């Protein structure tokens, strides 16, 4: 749930 965008 932080910025887990690859």
């Amino acid at each position, epitope marked *: *749930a*932080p*910025d*887990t*965008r*690859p």
Partner: single-chain antibody, 225 residues
Framework: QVQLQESGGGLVQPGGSMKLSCVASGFTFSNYWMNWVRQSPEKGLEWVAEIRLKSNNYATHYAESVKGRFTISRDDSKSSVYLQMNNLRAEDTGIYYC????????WGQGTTVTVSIVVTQESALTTSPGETVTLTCRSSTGAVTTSNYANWVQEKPDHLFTGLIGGTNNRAPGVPARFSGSLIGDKAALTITGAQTEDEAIYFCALWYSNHWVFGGGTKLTVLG
């Protein structure tokens, strides 16, 4: 080569105000959350603020230490993030970095500001070239889990920070394969499998707790021989 470049720091009196800027290049800035993190001799790395995307209506969160005094903002058209600092205190003194991506891959060189839960890591470890060394990162709250999204960041001399691992065990792009992230005995862990002389550096972990980050105190790794 992604680049982040902070500006706006200086030498200021307590009670004053100042706005920092950070310009990004080499990645799709608008797709990622951005953070400010600061470094003092006395408090190590401290996460300050985050800002999310245009689809989150640019939602922000702050460390309790700066809440009500600092404001983070961004301008996606200029690939820039900002930090408005009001009611500066001596304790705000430090080097301020903009950082983000998976979750702390990229850091700027920092801008110096001079005003005039506990995460535990090993103070120091000593290794030699070709050895396998494991650094650890403990939470005062209980076991570290994948819900803490452990990151590992390396500091090389004169404040050159690079993110190594995010999301527990995801290696940031172009990070050497000798680095790996894990969970071991309810701590997060960073393993260097075949340490190299250039790995002598300070290593910080950061753990996520639902809506904020806490950085550990860092481990000084010496590589002798």
């Amino acid at each position: 080569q992604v680049q982040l470049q902070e500006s706006g720091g200086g030498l200021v009196q307590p009670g004053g105000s100042m706005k920092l800027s950070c310009v990004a290049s080499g990645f799709t800035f608008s797709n990622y959350w951005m953070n400010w993190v600061r470094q003092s001799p006395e408090k190590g790395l401290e996460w300050v603020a985050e800002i999310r995307l245009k689809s989150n209506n640019y939602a922000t969160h702050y460390a309790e230490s700066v809440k009500g005094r600092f404001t983070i903002s961004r301008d996606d058209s200029k690939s820039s993030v900002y930090l408005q600092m009001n009611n500066l205190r001596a304790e705000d003194t430090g080097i301020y970095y903009c950082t983000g991506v998976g979750q702390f891959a990229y850091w700027g060189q920092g801008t110096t500001v001079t005003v005039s839960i506990v995460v535990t890591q090993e103070s120091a470890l000593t290794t030699s070239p070709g050895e396998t060394v494991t650094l650890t990162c403990r939470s005062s709250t209980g076991a570290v889990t994948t819900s803490n999204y452990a990151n590992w960041v390396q500091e090389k001399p004169d404040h050159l920070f690079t993110g190594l691992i995010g999301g527990t065990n995801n290696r940031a792009p172009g990070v050497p394969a000798r680095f790996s992230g894990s969970l071991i005995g309810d701590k997060a862990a960073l393993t260097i499998t075949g340490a190299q002389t250039e790995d002598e550096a300070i290593y910080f972990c950061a753990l996520w707790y639902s809506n904020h980050w806490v950085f550990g105190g860092g481990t000084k790794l010496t590589v002798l021989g």
